[PDB]
Amino acid sequence: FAKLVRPPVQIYGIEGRYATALYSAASKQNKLEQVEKELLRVAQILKEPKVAASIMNPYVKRSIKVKSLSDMTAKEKFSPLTSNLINLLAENGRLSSTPGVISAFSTMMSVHRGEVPCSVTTASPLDEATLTELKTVLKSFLSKGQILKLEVKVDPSIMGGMIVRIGEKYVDMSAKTKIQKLSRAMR
Amino acid sequence: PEGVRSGAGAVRDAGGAFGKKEQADEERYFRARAREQLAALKKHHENE
Amino acid sequence: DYHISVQNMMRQKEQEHMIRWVEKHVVQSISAQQEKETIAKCIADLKLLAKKAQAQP
Amino acid sequence: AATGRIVAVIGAVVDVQFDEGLPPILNALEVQGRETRLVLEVAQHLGESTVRTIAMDGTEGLVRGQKVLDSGAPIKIPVGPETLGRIMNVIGEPIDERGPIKTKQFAAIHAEAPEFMEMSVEQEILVTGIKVVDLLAPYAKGGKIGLFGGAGVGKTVLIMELINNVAKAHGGYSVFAGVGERTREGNDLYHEMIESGVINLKDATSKVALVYGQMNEPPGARARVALTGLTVAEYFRDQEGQDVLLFIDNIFRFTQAGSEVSALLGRIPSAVGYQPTLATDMGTMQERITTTKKGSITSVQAIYVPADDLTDPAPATTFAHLDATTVLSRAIAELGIYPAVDPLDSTSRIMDPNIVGSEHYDVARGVQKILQDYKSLQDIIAILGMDELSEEDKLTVSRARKIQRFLSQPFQVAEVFTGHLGKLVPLKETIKGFQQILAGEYDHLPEQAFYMVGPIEEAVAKADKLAEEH
Amino acid sequence: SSILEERILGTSVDLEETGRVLSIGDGIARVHGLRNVQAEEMVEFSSGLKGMSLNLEPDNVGVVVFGNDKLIKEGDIVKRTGAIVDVPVGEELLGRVVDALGNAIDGKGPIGSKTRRRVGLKAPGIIPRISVREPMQTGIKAVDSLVPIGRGQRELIIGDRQTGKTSIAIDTIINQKRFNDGTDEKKKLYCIYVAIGQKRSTVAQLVKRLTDADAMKYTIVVSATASDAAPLQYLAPYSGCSMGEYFRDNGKHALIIYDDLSKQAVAYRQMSLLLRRPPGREAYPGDVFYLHSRLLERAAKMNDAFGGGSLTALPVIETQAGDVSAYIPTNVISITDGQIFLETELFYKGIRPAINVGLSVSRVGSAAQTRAMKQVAGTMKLELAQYREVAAFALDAATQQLLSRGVRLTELLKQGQYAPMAIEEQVAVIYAGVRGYLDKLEPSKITKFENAFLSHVISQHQALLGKIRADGKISEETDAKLKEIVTNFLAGFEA
């Protein structure tokens, strides 16, 4: 068996298997962006309730489903290896997890130029000027990488402070110090 | 052939009351004779 | 022995209640306006602290 | 020439993924980044460029994604005449703190058995000096020997006395392998062999090599030390035309160690919780301990019987691989008779009238017949008392009791326990003493004169002193 | 007032690696996240709990919790400390009661320690060891005379329920006071007690019993009761062995006791099944033998190049309806060096302690035993061995005398509770019996004679005992004295 190119994120599962195979296929012949766009279009066209009813009925014959999908993918527009992917999924009867496969491919492509997702949590909504200052310093921590993804969350459960997550890094600066002060009772 | 078949010496293998009762009697009976045999050995050797 | 034991028990009870009172009044005293002003001061302080941490690659 | 990464660590089983080349089964791998040396051995191919391995040491501290190297061959150990008087590891590393082992050759511990057209057909007797073995179940040169027994009946003392009697009077070399036993005894043997002069720390006239893996090791190591032990002896048998001796202590731990990882390898258990590959695994190893036409190997193996049950699948499938068996029993030991050898459950292959003569054969069969007849009389005595028996039955019982005592013997390595000096008895005195007792020439002596003595000449000298002191 | 102000008077935050929880149930947590995490590494939860990672899989990590699990919930945060699990060690732990992880639960205060040590380490090899040569005295007459124990050995106590296993260890611990209250440090011994699976009130009564005899000044108690989580009961014995090993490497001697090793295997079986590992015989894991083999191998006697220290072990096992051929007991029988058997039928026939001398063994050969005791015990062995083989039938020259002596000898071995004896007094009391000075008195009154004679000898003849203690052996003059003392007191003692 010929060796294949390994995706960075390397998720697992049946959707993981199909996504890894498709990524190895796309790395060869250099069609990553085109296949991502075509997968988005396929996600667009499979949300029709009529074709969903055709695809969510176990009584119908597999042969009928294969031709229906082959005709749709031959008359819609594109004929990349995505047609082969659709045909293989139809033959193996894995048409239920197609959203999972396309989502896995989407997150796989996102980490190809990975944005290093981050999160900031606060008790009260901070000002936007303080927000852009925080972005300015968070990019300084980011260093080598791409544009950080900032999720602003307002949780008033904490008395006050700030919680930051950057990838697997984690710094907690909040009213959690009350536990530290309570530990005086122990010693 | 299907049932349980016994053999020889099964009474002393279970180690119940009868096994120890059997053992002590032999111990006593053969503890008794050694005195006579030793006395006759001493008399024989002293005589000659 | 009897008197010494009784006095020690009283001391222990008073210490426990004082600790509880201090903690509860800390929670009670912390007010939303205090939280706003302290959180502004903390925004400055924690931004500087993040700068300090990021200064160590 | 390949590099992999660790992707899973469960218990003592590790999985490695390779991106360039796939090593074959039974290959050695080395982990990178540890202060000590950790070695992995390949077992299965799982597909999608992955293997499942077994560790030879502790696995704590491992991290997913750690680099692993490939050596390209099975485990290799030093071999030659420079390993005499040294202690080595499962993977061939000194553990006696005296420097490296400097040889010129190396060997792989996984080989294949000799073929049908290389076997030998020879049978000669090997005298040891023990009455029971030399009378009821003789040993043979270039044969296989087994010592079955439970817990606490005396396997180790007997295997030490066999060394002390046979090894010192032997021209050739010897190998000792310890599999899954106490370290405290491995400290005793080493210092015992120094005083006797068999192992020398100054000259170059040693005669024994030692290999050790004990019960404080993970199951991976305990299931391989035997192959390392026999690989050394194969060198002294083939590359040099000399006779060798091989002693193994508790070969049962070789099978138990393989049952502790079978479930983690994805297997359905067989009866009484054993792996489904018991007999084949045992047979593959046992076939390499043989005397071919280029040399001779005489082997002695100690076997453990769980809970005194001889129908257990581990000892049950071992009787077929031996030429002579001795079975130790707990009932005899409680009477105070040592060694506690069962006289009606031991067998040998050279117990034939055309190999040992007619006199020797008739004496042993006559002893066994009366020992079998003794058992049936003990049922009658339970119900009716001893004195109601006929005189012939009393004479039969009196002779049988005296025969039973005369089989005991004081050993030389047990002077601390018993408090007597050891004895050795040649074969002719062994035959003649039992022939005389069967004839009836000592019906005028008490039983106690036949207990813990050597030849027949000492029992009357003991009885005379007993008479004098009365 | 100012004390608490100073406590709060004495805060840094730094980045850490983190995973997130996927699932939680029955004490097992599945964590997505952590990448560079070692096997058998201690991690910390948000609330304050602690855990250890055992299964490292491609997509998750299986973590067992050291405590309750009603606070963990999906979506939480886990951090890694970076160190393999370890416990505090030292000699500041003497006189304290601590849990399985080294936390005080007696209410005294914090423990001031300066050293830590891992719980999983390897036993010494072949070179650093030496033979066993010194005695370990207990105070039980039936043990010190027929089943002697040396320093550096392992010995098993096995029996049914309600037979008397705990009181042997409790008596052994108390006896060591007469040596620790002395001058030379070559005859002192420290003690460690580990309780697994028992309820709290029993441990409280045991600690009260110890503290009223002035014995807590040199003992350490490690407890993991029946209300604790399974991982703590699984981890408790190693945490105590690691505390015992500290004395062994500094030229000192120590003693350790594992109470009810049978209750560690049930916690191991519970912990393993919830991790989705296949079962085996009686659903036990596939390697229960290796659980105890790596534990009982850590007791050894070191030679002079390493200091000369030692460590002794005394495990305990319980059997169902006197069945010694079960699964677990057979594993541990084949590891130790000897065993002591206790039976109910002997317990109800007035033989207390109920030691079966026909089966109990000790694979030391009396190499470590005082010279004086051997002279009077080697001769008692033969008397009892010959008594057993005849005197059970469910003449006067041999048989009547034999059982007349045997019935006297049996009565001498009975003993009370919480009262061990010194060696020389046992030597004297056995010397009286063996020589035949008590072959005339009715057997029913022997115990009163023992008590009164011991009190009289202790009070009026304090100089005689010192001779036997100092010399280590009997002498012609001592033998001459003892006969006169015995005959005179026997004549005077008829009441």
Add this chain to the structure above:
Amino acid sequence: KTGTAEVSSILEERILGASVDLEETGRVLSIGDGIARVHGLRNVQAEEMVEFSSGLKGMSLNLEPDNVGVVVFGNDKLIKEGDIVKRTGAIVDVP
């Protein structure tokens, strides 16, 4: 419920279009303890003898919808993933 043949290497060749027989030959997927899983051999009869690349022989016992399990007449050391198996069209016979 992932099948034995639902692996990335097999699927990718179907994705990349595509000279292989798959009617008289096959390829090995996994090997261990004397059992081999083979992909292909659509015409193999039950209880038939095949030949491996090295020179060893085997026998077909399980005919599953996506693979066939074979028992090896020798030592597993000479078989590795990716080898080629071919038919012989006969059942065992002796002189």
